[PDB]
Write a protein that binds this ligand. Structure first.
Ligand SMILES: Cc1cc(/C=C/C#N)cc(C)c1Nc1nc(Nc2ccc(C#N)cc2)nc(OCCCN2CCOCC2)n1
Lengths: 549, 412
């Protein structure tokens, strides 16, 4: 007998104040009971379980399920899981193919044997107790408890991975010419070694695993490239998403679009130029059929054009530079590609604007850059160089005059329309020679009736009456009137902190049709100076009296 | 050699804070650092039975080429029991902010000599993440007092007190203050003899049994303060007078008898913004009386240790920043202005980050705790970049203002 090393057990406890499961064992057919007894007899013979006396008060329901009409044992650990402590789950966040490195050889080994070589904490085994009902309920049912990590239990996947990692750790550290990764019951080893050396390293690994009594099926594993893994397709020199098929339908329900958006969202990480807004603006009742707008139908038609052919992403090469390029798609949609060599994307992606009342392209661009930056640190551990559709001069003007602090990491201008620009720019000082418009708005809170208008230094005046409106709309309306009736240069004086707060935010697009009209007016102007004064302070010009009525 | 019992607040479990993405350079540093701390018994690997986690990253202190490990114990700190010591609460040295020169020392390594309570160690767990989640993260927990934790100065306070006794009896004029991992030493001595007394102190610390070589010299007696000032012009345009009235109307929220009537009387009629307006006698008098009022202090402005300090920061452009510390609106305990050029000429975020640090440092000296910041920046921009420029061993709290405040130019 060759001495094998024990595997360190992990101290498991129940949540504070709680106790183990006490669930009644369900009555089983004589057919199923016979099946379970045989199974648990050899499991005991393998050391996976053990018979326990009447002392144990804990119980967990065990079922028997016909393995596709051929018996399988199924212990329902749902009650124990709710009462088991929280673990440090390590799978949280799967690797992304774009961050991996190409391998000449990637071998797979089965780790179904090593699972039952991981023992459970001695003081916790009692909580895993279950009963095999007796035939006709005429004897005390057979009581068992687990000795190894039970299938289905809360702590099993975490303890298994941490135990496997701890074993593979010296092998990985001493063999830096290979890479090892674990995916549920299977081990994946990759290397760029000469194939001869590669087969040996696998055997060394198998020999290393033997120290803990872990045997691989000593055979050439059927699994070979390409690998189907977490929705991806892994090839030795490239990667892609598992085939995206857009279904042909005359009737789309709420659920169908969710299936459509989800696939489009998933495919957007390698298929460039994927749009989803006009299909996401329909899900604003999964069986309810929703009519697809003409604007959305044209988007789906463009989607099928992009999903026409398979596209592949390359792997990461640490010796080269990392580049991210962004393009504006319109309607608050942005798309990007990340590459090292031209026309060879590591991955792609998209960004959608946040739900707000007002917004501009420069802000969205910044948000996209930050998202990509955060994603790129996760995947590659560094920040890509950016190629942006915005002039250097435009960015400088923006951030040196913006009230908030803002920053874009190292980037260059790429001239691929539609370019991002500033549409209007307010003056810092009053304009000499320009007509001065004192504007004001007011509305009766009850009748919803209100007035808006202005007075000027040249004697120009206007007051318009308005129905179905608020104080905030009439304040905005007043500014719009001044813009309409003024020349290319104009000074506007308002007491509305609300209006100022909006225009100081500098939107180029908005939900409110009122604000949009103002923006279209600002754009047409050569110079606009906005000035604020407090209300009701008897500041002449500020003519509340024309709107108070 | 013996540990002091530590627990959490009743009804609160340990911190379960996600580790945020780290760059390759910071991961390598943290690995290299944690390798050695494990060999020194400072930290120990842990298993999956430990669900608790606290973020970690890496910085470079003021003018240094050596990485420092920084743990974000902000969650653990607000969950660990209000650690009152045998001190019954140290009264914050109100003479510290009056000293001519204050140097700040890093006595963090001193904490590594005192062991941590075994039952509490599980709460200090942290993860060194891997790029792209390829390998599992390396999990450690502390075995000694961790830098950054609230209980570290409190526990070590019993030790630190009798370490500095030979220095405090010899120099009864020097004021010494300890916040977190930083030791604040202020004196009225000349900077030359100041640096010697500091060097004497760190050699007095190294001898006692404990990078304590870097110094951070402040000057509280030369610190910036801001009264409210109004313009002095020979010719006022309508726009000038309109901004003045706006500023006075705002200041009236702070000061009692502010009047704008006579000044507004000049604005009566609809004139051009750039038109010069001669001041009347009643207007000049009103403006004169208003200057007088603004020179006096604000009425009823006190500090309450049981309340939060709040800091507001405005970007003024051209590298300048203004800020106000208060607990009650219009009740400023401190105001200030910056214009620093520490390699941030083309970076708003680095400036803001240095501003937040400078304001926090000031706040520790004056009141002995950190303010809750309100930053003129989107959450997503700040969260992506502030760690790249952070050089302080502590970390304040902050929220984000998204609407442009009108009161920006009234502080410039
Ligand atoms: C996540 C992952 C999934 C699977 C399979 C799942 C299924 N089913 C398999 C592995 C092995 C990994 N882990 C991993 N994989 C790669 N690449 C890679 C390329 C192609 C294929 C295919 N086909 C598979 C993998 N690279 C790294 O790290 C980069 C180290 C850079 N080296 C270090 C040595 O000196 C040289 C530089 N880790």
């Amino acid at each position: 007998m060759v001495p094998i090393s024990p595997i360190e057990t992990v101290p498991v406890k129940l949540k504070p104040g709680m106790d183990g499961p006490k669930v009644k064992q369900w009555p089983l057919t004589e057919e199923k009971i016979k099946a379970l007894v045989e199974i648990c007899t050899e499991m005991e013979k393998e050391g996976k379980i053990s018979k326990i006396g009447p002392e144990n008060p804990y119980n967990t329901p065990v079922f028997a399920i016909k393995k596709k009409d051929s018996w399988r044992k199924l212990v329902d650990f749902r009650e124990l899981n709710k009462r088991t402590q929280d673990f440090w789950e390590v799978q949280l966040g799967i690797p992304h193919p774009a961050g991996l490195k190409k391998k000449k050889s990637v071998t797979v080994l089965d780790v179904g044997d090593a699972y039952f070589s991981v023992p459970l904490d001695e003081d916790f085994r009692k909580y895993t107790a279950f009963t095999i009902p007796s035939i006709n309920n005429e004897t005390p049912g057979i009581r068992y408890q687990y000795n190894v990590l039970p299938q289905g239990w809360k702590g099993s996947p975490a303890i298994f991975q941490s135990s496997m990692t701890k074993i593979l750790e010296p092998f990985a550290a001493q063999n830096p010419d290979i890479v090892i990764y674990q995916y549920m019951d299977d081990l994946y080893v990759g290397s760029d070694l000469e194939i001869g050396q590669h087969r040996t390293k696998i055997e060394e690994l198998r020999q290393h695993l033997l120290r803990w009594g872990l045997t691989t099926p000593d055979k050439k594993h059927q699994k070979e490239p390409p690998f189907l893994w977490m929705g991806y397709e892994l090839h030795p020199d490239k990667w892609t998403v598992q085939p995206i098929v857009l279904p042909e339908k005359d009737s789309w329900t709420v659920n169908d679009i969710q299936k459509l958006v989800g696939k489009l969202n998933w495919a957007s990480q390698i298929y460039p130029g994927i749009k989803v807004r006009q299909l996401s603006k329909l899900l604003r009742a999964l069986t309810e059929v929703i009519p697809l707008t003409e604007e959305a139908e044209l988007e789906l038609a463009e989607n099928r054009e992009i999903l026409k052919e398979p596209v592949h992403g390359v792997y990461y090469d640490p010796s080269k530079d990392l580049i991210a390029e962004i393009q504006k798609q319109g309607q608050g949609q942005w798309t990007y590609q990340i590459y090292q060599e031209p026309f060879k994307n590591l991955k792609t992606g998209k960004y959608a604007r946040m739900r707000g009342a007002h917004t501009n392209d420069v802000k969205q661009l910044t948000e996209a850059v930050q998202k990509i930056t955060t994603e790129s640190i996760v995947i590659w551990g560094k920040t890509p160089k950016f190629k942006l559709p915005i002039q250097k001069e435009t960015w400088e003007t923006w951030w040196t005059e913006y009230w908030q602090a803002t920053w874009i990491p190292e980037w260059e201008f790429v001239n691929t329309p539609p370019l991002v620009k500033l549409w209007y720019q307010l003056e810092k000082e009053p304009i000499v020679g320009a007509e001065t418009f004192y504007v004001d708005g007011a509305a009766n809170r009850e009748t919803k009736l209100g007035k808006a208008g202005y007075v000027t230094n040249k004697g120009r005046q206007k007051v318009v009456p308005l129905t179905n409106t608020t104080n905030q709309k009439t304040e905005l309306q007043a500014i719009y009137l001044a813009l309409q009736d003024s020349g290319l240069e104009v000074n506007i004086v308002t007491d509305s902190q609300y209006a100022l707060g909006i225009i100081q935010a500098q939107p180029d697009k908005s939900e409110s049709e009122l604000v949009n009209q103002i923006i279209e007016q600002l754009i047409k102007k050569e110079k606009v100076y906005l000035a604020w004064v407090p209300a009701h302070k008897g500041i002449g010009g500020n003519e509340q009296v024309d709107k108070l009525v | 050699i013996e540990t002091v019992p530590v627990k959490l607040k009743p009804g609160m479990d340990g911190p379960k804070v996600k580790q945020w993405p780290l760059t390759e350079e910071k991961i390598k540093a943290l690995v290299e650092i944690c390798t050695e701390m494990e060999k020194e018994g400072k930290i120990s690997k842990i298993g999956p039975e430990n669900p608790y986690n606290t973020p970690v990253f890496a910085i470079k202190k003021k003018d240094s080429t050596k990485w420092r490990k920084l743990v974000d114990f902000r969650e653990l700190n607000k969950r660990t029991q209000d650690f009152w010591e045998v001190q019954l609460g140290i009264p914050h040295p109100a003479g510290l902010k009056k000293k001519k020169s204050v140097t700040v020392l890093d006595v963090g390594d001193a904490y590594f000599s005192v062991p941590l309570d075994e039952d509490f160690r599980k709460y200090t767990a942290f993860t060194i993440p891997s790029i792209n989640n390829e390998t599992p993260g390396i999990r450690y927990q502390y075995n000694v007092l961790p830098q950054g934790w609230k209980g570290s100065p409190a526990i070590f306070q019993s030790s630190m007190t009798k370490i500095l006794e030979p220095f405090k009896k010899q120099n009864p004029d020097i004021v010494i203050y300890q916040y977190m991992d930083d030791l604040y030493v202020g004196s009225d001595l000349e900077i030359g003899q100041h640096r010697t007394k500091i060097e004497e102190l760190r050699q007095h610390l190294l001898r006692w049994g404990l990078f304590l070589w870097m110094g951070y010299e402040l000057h509280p007696d030369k610190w910036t303060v801001q009264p409210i000032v109004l313009p002095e012009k020979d010719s006022w345009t309508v726009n000038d007078i309109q901004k003045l009235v706006g500023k006075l109307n705002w200041a009236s929220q702070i000061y009692p008898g502010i009047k704008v009537r006579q000044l507004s009387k000049l604005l009566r009629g609809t004139k051009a913004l750039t038109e010069v307006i001669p001041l009347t006698e009643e207007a000049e008098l009103e403006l004169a009386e208003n200057r007088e009022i603004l020179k006096e202090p604000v009425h009823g402005v006190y500090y309450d240790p049981s309340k939060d300090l709040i800091a507001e920061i405005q970007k003024q452009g051209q590298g300048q920043w203004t800020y106000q510390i208060y607990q009650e609106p219009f009740k400023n305990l401190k105001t200030g202005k910056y214009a620093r050029m520490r390699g941030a000429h083309t970076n708003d975020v680095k400036q803001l980050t240095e501003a937040v640090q400078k304001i926090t440092t000031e706040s520790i000296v004056i009141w002995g705790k950190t303010p809750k910041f309100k930053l003129p920046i989107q959450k997503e921009t700040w969260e992506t970049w502030w760690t790249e420029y952070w050089q302080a061993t502590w970390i304040p709290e902050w929220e984000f203002v998204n609407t442009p405040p009108l009161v920006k130019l009234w502080y410039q």
